[PDB]
From a paper:
ABC toxin complexes (Tcs) are a class of α-pore forming toxins (αPFTs) that consist of three subunits capable of assembling into a single protein apparatus with the ability to shuttle and translocate toxic peptides into target cells. The two [name] termed Xn-XptA1 and Xn-[name] are the targeting components of each complex and display variations in insect specificity. The [name] are the largest subunits of the complex and contain a translocation channel with hydrophobic loops at the end allowing for membrane permeation.
We separated particle subsets based on structural variations in 2D and 3D classifications indicative of RBD A mobility and observed the State 2 intermediate in the Xn-[name] wt data. We were able to resolve the Xn-[name] wt State 2 structure to 3.9 Å resolution, leading us to conclude that the State 2 structure is a physiological intermediate state preceding the pore state conformational change in Xn-[name] wt. Upon closer inspection of the region around RBD A in both Xn-[name] State 2 structures, we observed an opening in the outer shell of the protein where RBD A pivots outward. The narrowest area of this pore in the Xn-[name] wt State 2 structure has a maximum radius of 4.28 Å that is surrounded by four amino acids from two separate protomers: D518 (Chain A), Q152 (Chain E), D156 (Chain E), and S291 (Chain A). Comparatively, in the Xn-[name] YWKT structure, the narrowest constriction point in the pore has a maximum radius of 4.6 Å and is also compressed by four amino acids from two separate protomers: D518 (Chain A), Q152 (Chain E), Q294 (Chain A), and K291 (Chain A). This pore leads into the inner cavity space between the outer shell and the outside of the α-pore forming domains that make up the translocation channel. This makes it reasonable to conclude that once Xn-[name] contacts cell surface receptors or the cell membrane, this mechanical stress stimulates Xn-[name] to undergo a conformational change from the canonical pre-pore state or State 1 to the newly discovered alternative State 2. From this, we propose that once Xn-[name] encounters a target receptor, the protein undergoes a conformational change from State 1 to State 2 to allow an influx of solvent, presumably in the insect midgut at very basic pH levels, into the inner cavity to further stimulate an additional conformational change leading into the pore state transition.
Numbering used by the authors:
A (entry chain D), B (entry chain C): 2100 to 2148
C (entry chain C): 490 to 537
D (entry chain B): 441 to 537
E (entry chain B): 1807 to 2002
F (entry chain B): 50 to 293
G (entry chain D): 2198 to 2246
H (entry chain B): 880 to 1074
I (entry chain C): 978 to 1025
Write the structure that this text describes.
Amino acid sequence: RIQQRTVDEVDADIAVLAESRRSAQNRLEKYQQLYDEDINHGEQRAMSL
Amino acid sequence: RIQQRTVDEVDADIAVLAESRRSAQNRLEKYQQLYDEDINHGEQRAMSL
Amino acid sequence: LFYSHRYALSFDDAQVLNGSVINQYADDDSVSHFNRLFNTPPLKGKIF
Amino acid sequence: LTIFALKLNKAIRLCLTSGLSPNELQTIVRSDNAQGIINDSVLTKVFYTLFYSHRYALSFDDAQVLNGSVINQYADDDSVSHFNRLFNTPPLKGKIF
Amino acid sequence: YYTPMMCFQRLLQEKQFDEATQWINYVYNPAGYIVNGEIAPWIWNCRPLEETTSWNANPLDAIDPDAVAQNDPMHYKIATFMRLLDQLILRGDMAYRELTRDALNEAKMWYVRTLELLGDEPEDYGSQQWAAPSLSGAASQTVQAAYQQDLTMLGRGGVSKNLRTANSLVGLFLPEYNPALTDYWQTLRLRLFNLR
Amino acid sequence: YHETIEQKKNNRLLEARIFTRANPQLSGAIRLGIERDSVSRSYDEMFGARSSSFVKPGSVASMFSPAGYLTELYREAKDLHFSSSAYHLDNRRPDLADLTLSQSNMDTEISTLTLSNELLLEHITRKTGGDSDALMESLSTYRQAIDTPYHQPYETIRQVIMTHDSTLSALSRNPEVMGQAEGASLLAILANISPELYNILTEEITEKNADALFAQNFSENITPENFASQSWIAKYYGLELSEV
Amino acid sequence: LSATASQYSADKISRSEAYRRRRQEWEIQRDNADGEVKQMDAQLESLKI
Amino acid sequence: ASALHTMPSVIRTLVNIRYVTALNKAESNLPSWDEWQTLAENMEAGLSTQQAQTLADYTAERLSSVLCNWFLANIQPEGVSLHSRDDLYSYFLIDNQVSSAIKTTRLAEAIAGIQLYINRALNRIEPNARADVSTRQFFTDWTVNNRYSTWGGVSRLVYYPENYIDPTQRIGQTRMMDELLENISQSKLSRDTVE
Amino acid sequence: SSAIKTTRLAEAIAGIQLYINRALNRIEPNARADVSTRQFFTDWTVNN
């Protein structure tokens, strides 16, 4: 029984790390979109005028 | 068998450290270049104008 | 080549092992095998 | 100035070749005799004090006392002497004698 | 010359490529030039470069590569070419970031472009044959004087005499290959070995 | 002087131009954009194939390599002092004149101590006229110096014995063999006393042989007049005044 | 009016350069995010074995 | 014998050396010079490689120090008041008390020596300087010729200006083109802007 | 290496592109310079 509980514990830790991964990749792709778009048309207009 | 698997575990861990090593090293190199470039010709021209 | 494979030896070690003599004149821009055996460093004077 | 030069040359050569301090040579030569001269006995004391210093890990004072000399009352005297290291840190209630 | 160079260099600095190549084609184009619906007979698109005219007399007065280059225009020639193959390399780096198969083929295409245009790298020749003088003999004032005199005679003159200079006066040094060219050669070779 | 300086500059320019033309590195489609001049042929026939001769960077034969830099350096430096005076390069380092300029000479890696030692040996043996072994034998009994005598085999023994086991503690675990080893040898192998160091440490000092021993213990140029000065003792033994 | 136009040009190029620096910062911090993402991806496989 | 990893004969002999040096004990068993050398040779025979290098290092340094001292106390070439270690360093144009851990090549050492000699000459720290030759062309640029790297850059300039040619900025510019340059310095240059 | 995978269409694209490029740069001798001036080749920058 005790070892059943321990394998349960490690499975829970797997889930914890998995949702950690989801959060990290969210931050990543948000940064990536924010970086690729670089400078939008508003600042282009500011500099041009 | 169990002890073979624990050796497998530590091998996975050292690989993880290696990947994090590569990440930090990339951060280091990019910061190093970003520091050495210092001030490019754009800002020098701003100052001159 | 067989002995370098099995016993995990460089070339020259196996070369000596096969029945050939210690090579006293390698590339000569670096230390020869003979001077690798008896000349790292010389004891107090030059070897003979 | 010749003879004093010879004496000082002897002692300085010894201490430089032997890692010995001027006060250490002062103490060992005085303990050997009040002459301040060197013979086989002085070098005997030197060797054994350094040997015991190496093995038992004690200072020069402990080794010098061990060799058969006395505990020195008058060390460098700009710091606490050996004797006062033994019986004067602090005095019990009054000054030592 | 200078302003097309300016616009091209700034465009390359801003990671911009295609209108940069369109721009640099004003002054040079390996594919030649089209005028009046026809292929041009000239090679470079800058007349002074074709004619190889100098507009400096005493360039060594100051320490300026500008002075030296202007005193002999063909340096300028290779310089622009240099910068040209430069963007070619920069194309590959962009084409290689996405690790996508079609972009992979595109990067290989760029690298074969610069490989073909670059030619064939030469190799070391003189070091094997060069004899080893002593320092004093190498610093012999007489050998240096003889060489300088030969050079002056060649310059103001060009006399054909002394068909052999008695190479036994081995006390001179040999020209060394441009390090930047070898840098790009090794770059292409490493990236190609990587790509295969 | 002007005409000379413009002559040198023009020669440099012409060499540079002719060298850039024949660079095989530039082929290259840009090869089709370069021509062969009459001056090119003239240099060709005057200097043979030297014009076609190039080197890989990092080789000795390059004019920008450290070898040619040193050649120019010595060329310039050779005359900074009159040959007669003691500061002449030929006088101070005669072996520097005949230094070959080879790939092995700039590639190989040896400690600075090695060269320094052999140069000092060359001067000393030039002076005395003997060899290395005679020098070491003289050193083993030399007295007139702060480091003499210098018993190299003895110090080597001391160093190796310290290497294996300091304090000879294992040796102490064998008291029977200590029936044959007294304290004297153990002092010799624990502290730095060569036999002649013992002789100088254990010789009586009296006036009857005073100056004689002085002569034995010092060079002729050293005298008690020299010895009187404190700064002199500090510089003689390389010690600090507070220490003396 | 020459001086005022020069001041304008100076501040506009300086502003563009500030934008470029911000871009570099975004890029490096996104790279570091990606490094963390893959590093913890490796941590996941270690944990599941 | 096994404690020292060596033969019993040589430990017998080492113990056999009554270090009393002509009485105060039995007698002087001091070995002769060659006997000393042979005893040392045999005794150090059973030593490894990295220990061999360490012994070579220690002996080389000790020999260097002894040699420097001996040359000070023995040979005094006229024209120099050499009176210390660094005096020999300057006059022989080579360091004499560095650690053996440093390594170099012949060319590097000669470079350093000649540089230091030139430098000593220029600052008039040397007496009887031939000041006539100190004014030569090469010494004028001694600021940029004191280093191999700087000399290489300035020499490689004239033959290979292309490595050091920078289209982006040059001297001799007209402020008119410079004004173009600052007008094409925006973050993104589309076609019409450069037009 | 065989680690690269592709299709007949992709390789054919690559080969024909390389042929066009070689022709244009006058690396290939005996180019039919008349046809090299076609409208498609003017826009070779955006058609490569």
